[PDB]
Nucleic acid binder design. Structure first.
Ligand SMILES: [Mg+2]
Ligand SMILES: [Mg+2]
Ligand SMILES: [Mg+2]
Ligand SMILES: [Mg+2]
Ligand SMILES: [Mg+2]
Ligand SMILES: [Mg+2]
Ligand SMILES: [Mg+2]
Ligand SMILES: [Mg+2]
Ligand SMILES: [Mg+2]
Ligand SMILES: [Mg+2]
Ligand SMILES: [Mg+2]
Ligand SMILES: [Mg+2]
Ligand SMILES: [Mg+2]
Ligand SMILES: [Mg+2]
Ligand SMILES: [Mg+2]
Ligand SMILES: [Mg+2]
Ligand SMILES: [Mg+2]
Ligand SMILES: [Mg+2]
Ligand SMILES: [Mg+2]
Ligand SMILES: [Mg+2]
Ligand SMILES: [Mg+2]
Ligand SMILES: [Mg+2]
Ligand SMILES: [Mg+2]
Ligand SMILES: [Mg+2]
Ligand SMILES: [Mg+2]
Ligand SMILES: [Mg+2]
Ligand SMILES: [Mg+2]
Ligand SMILES: [Mg+2]
Ligand SMILES: [Mg+2]
Ligand SMILES: [Mg+2]
Ligand SMILES: [Mg+2]
Ligand SMILES: [Mg+2]
Ligand SMILES: [Mg+2]
Ligand SMILES: [Mg+2]
Ligand SMILES: [Mg+2]
Ligand SMILES: [Mg+2]
Ligand SMILES: [Mg+2]
Ligand SMILES: [Mg+2]
Ligand SMILES: [Mg+2]
Ligand SMILES: [Mg+2]
Ligand SMILES: [Mg+2]
Ligand SMILES: [Mg+2]
Ligand SMILES: [Mg+2]
Ligand SMILES: [Mg+2]
Ligand SMILES: [Mg+2]
Ligand SMILES: [Mg+2]
Ligand SMILES: [Mg+2]
Ligand SMILES: [Mg+2]
Ligand SMILES: [Mg+2]
Ligand SMILES: [Mg+2]
Ligand SMILES: [Mg+2]
Ligand SMILES: [Mg+2]
Ligand SMILES: [Mg+2]
Ligand SMILES: [Mg+2]
Ligand SMILES: [Mg+2]
Ligand SMILES: [Mg+2]
Ligand SMILES: [Mg+2]
Ligand SMILES: [Mg+2]
Ligand SMILES: [Mg+2]
Ligand SMILES: [Mg+2]
Ligand SMILES: [Mg+2]
Ligand SMILES: [Mg+2]
Ligand SMILES: [Mg+2]
Ligand SMILES: [Mg+2]
Ligand SMILES: [Mg+2]
Ligand SMILES: [Mg+2]
Ligand SMILES: [Mg+2]
Ligand SMILES: [Mg+2]
Ligand SMILES: [Mg+2]
Ligand SMILES: [Mg+2]
Ligand SMILES: [Mg+2]
Ligand SMILES: [Mg+2]
Ligand SMILES: [Mg+2]
Ligand SMILES: [Mg+2]
Ligand SMILES: [Mg+2]
Ligand SMILES: [Mg+2]
Ligand SMILES: [Mg+2]
Ligand SMILES: [Mg+2]
Ligand SMILES: [Mg+2]
Ligand SMILES: [Mg+2]
Ligand SMILES: [Mg+2]
Ligand SMILES: [Mg+2]
Ligand SMILES: [Mg+2]
Ligand SMILES: [Mg+2]
Ligand SMILES: [Mg+2]
Ligand SMILES: [Mg+2]
Ligand SMILES: [Mg+2]
Ligand SMILES: [Mg+2]
Ligand SMILES: [Mg+2]
Ligand SMILES: [Mg+2]
Ligand SMILES: [Mg+2]
Ligand SMILES: [Mg+2]
Lengths: 93, 271, 46
RNA sequence: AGGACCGAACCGACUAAUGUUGAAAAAUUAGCGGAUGACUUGUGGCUGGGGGUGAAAGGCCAAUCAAACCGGGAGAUAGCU
RNA sequence: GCUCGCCGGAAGACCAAGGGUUCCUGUCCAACGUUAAUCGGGGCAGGGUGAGUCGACCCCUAAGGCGAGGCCGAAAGGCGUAGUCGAUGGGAAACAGGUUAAUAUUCCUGUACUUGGUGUUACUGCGAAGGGGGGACGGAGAAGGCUAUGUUGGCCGGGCGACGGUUGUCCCGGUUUAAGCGUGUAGGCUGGUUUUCCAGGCAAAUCCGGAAAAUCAAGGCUGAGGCGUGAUGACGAGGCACUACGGUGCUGAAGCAACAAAUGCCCUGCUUCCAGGAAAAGCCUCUAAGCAUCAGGUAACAUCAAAUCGUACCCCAAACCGACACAGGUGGUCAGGUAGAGAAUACCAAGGCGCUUGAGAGAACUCGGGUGAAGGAACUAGGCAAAAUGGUGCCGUAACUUCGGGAGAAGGCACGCUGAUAUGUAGGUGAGGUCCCUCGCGGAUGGAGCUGAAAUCAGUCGAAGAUACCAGCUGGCUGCAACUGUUUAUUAAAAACACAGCACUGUGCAAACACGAAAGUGGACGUAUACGGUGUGACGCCUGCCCGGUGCCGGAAGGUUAAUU
């Protein structure tokens, strides 16, 4: 039982890329940017609550920020978490 | 027994090994083993406090019963065994009550013999008695010095102690070193010499043989520089000094015992 | 040939890390000196 | 069986030539020694400076050692340049 | 794109450590790249790392660290008990195929497995901070049984050849399939089974250890591989159609046998030696307190859960350690063909490269090599360097010797190819068939097929048959050190150091000695056949005289002599 504020915080944005598009067409999987401390169970519960779909499994990876130089000054982007969410082959969000 | 190797190599030319066919060839008794890792001569400060120690073969400690205080229950010798931790052989004995113990093997003790400790034990090798019950003139080993503490004198291969006099609460022993010592008659002693008396006839034959036993090379003092040893320095082979230890104490004849606490028990020094 | 710096993160941490510094008063004095100087990196941990 | 023998990996470093503002602040090339052992190696640990460790050369202790390095006494002192 | 060359026990592939975006795509060439650059590990933007089973985390410990109280110390602190950390070690479980530009044992397909929680059903003595077993352990050697793998044959598909020949004993290619599940084989170990009793395992125990009978004599444990299934599946040469020249879609033959064979597996096994070869938990089992027709235990079934972190890329290197895109260093794993003893070496496969300045010329001189008339150490400090020797089998081999050696002493002979012995022998393997029954992963016979030395005889070619690569120079006298080792990282490898052996000496255990204001620790869980120090340095024959000097040991009658009074 994960409370509604937690569920409303964990999801951040959908991830837009060609690998994501291919996954969504081919394996019924959406790719999301989630909260850095979100767990698989929380992502599953949040997806089901706020998209009223069904989920069988979640796969998570943490992306590491890219070190970038901006006008001769070292700067590092933030690490974020990415989730691969599989839907139960009838949902089609 | 004592057998010379054949000179098939320079390292084997001079090796003499002592081989006992009667030693158990299998693994030791698992319930009576601990672990004892090596020190390297280093103390809890991490400093070398004894030199020429290091390396060697891994060993496991066999709990030997030096107290021999299971009185009245006879035991039978199961097998002689090789102990890497001492120069003597240990015999595994089995008590009538189903308990097994390691004891130092006396001379002539073979598998199947009966041993027993206590004041009522018979006068035969392997039997531990109080020294007031042991007759005067007997040859003992594994002697105690404080009653109930455990045997401490004459534990090495071939060693033993003579009982030369019993006057009062004290018995006079002729220690292996030649020193005559007094000890309380209540302390225990096992009858007979320690076995493996041929242990001193072995010849290591090569430097690696001594390295196997954890002994490291000894550098002569006269081969060093003066900053390292009192004997150091010289152009060519020079000595011109009185021999001393690496810490300046004269090392040929200067006595170092100072124990007024135990001076009273020494009837006569070893000479 | 074999140079003197053979990197190893575990040994680096166990020898010059924040907790190894804080384990002793001399280490804490090291940390105090570095804080007073204003070092942006107190220890090797970061 | 063997601190046995010949010989790769591996560990070493006897000779010669090259290089010597080097390809390299110690190497390359051709030969050379050991190669089941007192062998070699990975990982971790311990020993701290008049101290360690040293099969001992005053060797080694981070390219530094007849007393490491860093900071301080300190602008030591310098009848010398 | 086509040729050419190089590595192939690596200069190929995969990890660990270390690095951190270098990975992939688009774009740009100012600076960086020792030149140009359209290129790049460069700049800029975007993308990319998916796990119940891999690793960490986690449970458990080693060395060692920290350490409540404690002991000790001017202070700071030092040591350490109970504890608690600490892998480089022990502990549950997944494979094959497919797919991206970049991830995959992580995604998809197929087929599995492990642990734990619940909830029903049946039966039921459960219970530990305690007992026992187990985990759980060396070096060397040898052999048998296998597999990975390779070769050939069969089979299938294709081919009939740029120049003489090539429908054949001809050429090219393919001939693959896992974990799991079932079976239990080569081998290894072990006598079982049931009663009774017990000074042991801190108490208890039905568990372990011990004792005594009875009975049966075969039961158990472990175990590679093979076989069956997984799998009518997948993969598959190739063929057909395409975008669009990257690659997509469809279909898909054969998919067997023999032989050889590991350094891999059975095997933590076996034999043997002495230098005598971790710990703790998980696991199995026994009970105590306690609970007691409850809990809890076992079994079956259903259901749920397995979180978090890493995952790109380099990794003998242009990405790590060397200031460099630096001829250096860097642990582990894999291990094809031909010849060979071989992981050497030569040529090759898979695979990867041509080393980020070139074009000419063809002087001296320098570097690295080839050959050299006659002579052959005359060179030189010195045969430094070079040249030479170099394999296998057989014959043969001196002084001396510690009887092992010296010794590969020295020296010599044979060596290719073809045929026959023998259309391929001795040997190895071993089908069908038949027989036997304990009927099967069985035993006997049998020899098809496959593989296959070595030798002799005869012939034959060349200047030369160990033809390349590869691969001891030998002997004599002598000093030193016995020997194998070690050493001045970076001018000294030796005759120096060590050494086994010898001797002197200290040390009676709370040992001497050493580190330490101390507590403590090492010596040593050792006990005079032991330990420390010193000198000498295998072995053989030996080791002579001097105690005056200095040192040490012993003595204590006398002289002198501190604090103190
Ligand atoms: Mg999944
Ligand atoms: Mg144990
Ligand atoms: Mg010593
Ligand atoms: Mg010695
Ligand atoms: Mg010297
Ligand atoms: Mg010293
Ligand atoms: Mg001196
Ligand atoms: Mg002289
Ligand atoms: Mg003189
Ligand atoms: Mg050898
Ligand atoms: Mg040799
Ligand atoms: Mg190496
Ligand atoms: Mg040199
Ligand atoms: Mg070389
Ligand atoms: Mg070599
Ligand atoms: Mg050799
Ligand atoms: Mg200082
Ligand atoms: Mg000198
Ligand atoms: Mg430095
Ligand atoms: Mg240095
Ligand atoms: Mg000084
Ligand atoms: Mg001053
Ligand atoms: Mg100063
Ligand atoms: Mg000044
Ligand atoms: Mg002056
Ligand atoms: Mg090309
Ligand atoms: Mg080639
Ligand atoms: Mg890393
Ligand atoms: Mg970058
Ligand atoms: Mg790239
Ligand atoms: Mg690009
Ligand atoms: Mg340029
Ligand atoms: Mg330009
Ligand atoms: Mg780039
Ligand atoms: Mg993950
Ligand atoms: Mg695992
Ligand atoms: Mg500990
Ligand atoms: Mg402590
Ligand atoms: Mg305290
Ligand atoms: Mg722990
Ligand atoms: Mg580990
Ligand atoms: Mg593990
Ligand atoms: Mg990749
Ligand atoms: Mg236990
Ligand atoms: Mg182990
Ligand atoms: Mg063994
Ligand atoms: Mg072994
Ligand atoms: Mg096979
Ligand atoms: Mg196979
Ligand atoms: Mg055909
Ligand atoms: Mg033709
Ligand atoms: Mg063919
Ligand atoms: Mg199969
Ligand atoms: Mg029993
Ligand atoms: Mg081997
Ligand atoms: Mg990868
Ligand atoms: Mg590579
Ligand atoms: Mg370059
Ligand atoms: Mg390089
Ligand atoms: Mg090969
Ligand atoms: Mg050859
Ligand atoms: Mg090669
Ligand atoms: Mg190729
Ligand atoms: Mg020229
Ligand atoms: Mg020339
Ligand atoms: Mg020549
Ligand atoms: Mg000539
Ligand atoms: Mg000539
Ligand atoms: Mg001549
Ligand atoms: Mg001559
Ligand atoms: Mg001359
Ligand atoms: Mg001349
Ligand atoms: Mg001359
Ligand atoms: Mg020469
Ligand atoms: Mg030559
Ligand atoms: Mg020859
Ligand atoms: Mg000779
Ligand atoms: Mg010969
Ligand atoms: Mg035959
Ligand atoms: Mg075969
Ligand atoms: Mg002479
Ligand atoms: Mg001379
Ligand atoms: Mg020598
Ligand atoms: Mg040598
Ligand atoms: Mg060394
Ligand atoms: Mg060296
Ligand atoms: Mg040098
Ligand atoms: Mg003697
Ligand atoms: Mg003590
Ligand atoms: Mg000498
Ligand atoms: Mg005198
Ligand atoms: Mg005197």
């Amino acid at each position: 039982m994960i409370r509604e504020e937690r569920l409303l915080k964990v999801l951040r944005a959908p991830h837009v890329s060609e690998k994501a598009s291919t996954a969504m067409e081919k394996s019924n999987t959406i790719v999301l940017k989630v909260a850095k401390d979100a767990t698989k169970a929380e992502i599953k519960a949040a997806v089901q609550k706020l998209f009223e779909v069904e989920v069988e499994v979640v796969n998570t990876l943490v992306v590491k920020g890219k070190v970038k130089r901006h006008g001769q000054r070292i700067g590092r982007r933030s690490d974020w978490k990415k989730a691969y969410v599989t839907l139960k082959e009838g949902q089609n969000l | 027994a004592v057998v010379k190797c054949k000179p098939t190599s320079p390292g084997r030319r001079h090796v003499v090994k002592v081989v006992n066919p009667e030693l158990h060839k299998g693994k030791p008794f698992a319930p009576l083993l601990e672990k004892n890792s090596k020190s390297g001569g280093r103390n809890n400060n991490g400093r070398i406090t004894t030199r020429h120690i290091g390396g060697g073969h891994k060993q496991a400690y066999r709990i030997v019963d030096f107290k021999r205080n299971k009185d009245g229950i006879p035991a039978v010798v199961e097998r002689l065994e090789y102990d890497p931790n001492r120069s003597a052989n240990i015999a595994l004995v089995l008590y009538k009550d189903g308990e097994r113990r390691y004891i130092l093997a006396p001379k002539g003790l073979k598998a199947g013999d009966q041993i027993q400790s206590g004041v009522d034990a018979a006068i035969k090798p392997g039997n531990t008695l109080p020294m007031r019950n042991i007759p005067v003139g007997s040859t003992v080993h594994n002697v105690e010095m404080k009653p109930g503490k455990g045997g401490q004198l004459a534990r090495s291969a071939g060693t033993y102690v003579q009982i030369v006099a019993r006057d009062g609460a004290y018995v006079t022993l002729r220690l292996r070193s030649g020193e005559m010592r007094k000890v309380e008659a209540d302390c225990r002693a096992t009858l007979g010499e320690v076995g493996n008396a041929e242990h001193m006839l072995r010849v290591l034959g090569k430097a690696g043989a001594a390295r196997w036993r954890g002994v490291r090379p000894t550098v002569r003092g006269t081969a060093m520089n003066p900053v390292d040893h009192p004997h150091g320095g010289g152009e060519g082979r020079n000595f011109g000094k009185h021999p001393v230890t690496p810490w300046g104490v004269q090392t040929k004849g200067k006595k170092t015992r100072s124990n007024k606490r135990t001076d009273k028990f020494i009837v006569r020094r070893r000479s | 040939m074999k140079r003197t710096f053979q990197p190893s993160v575990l040994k680096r941490n166990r020898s010059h890390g924040f907790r190894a510094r804080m384990a002793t008063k001399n280490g804490r004095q090291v940390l105090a000196r570095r804080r007073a100087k204003g070092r942006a990196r107190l220890t090797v941990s970061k």
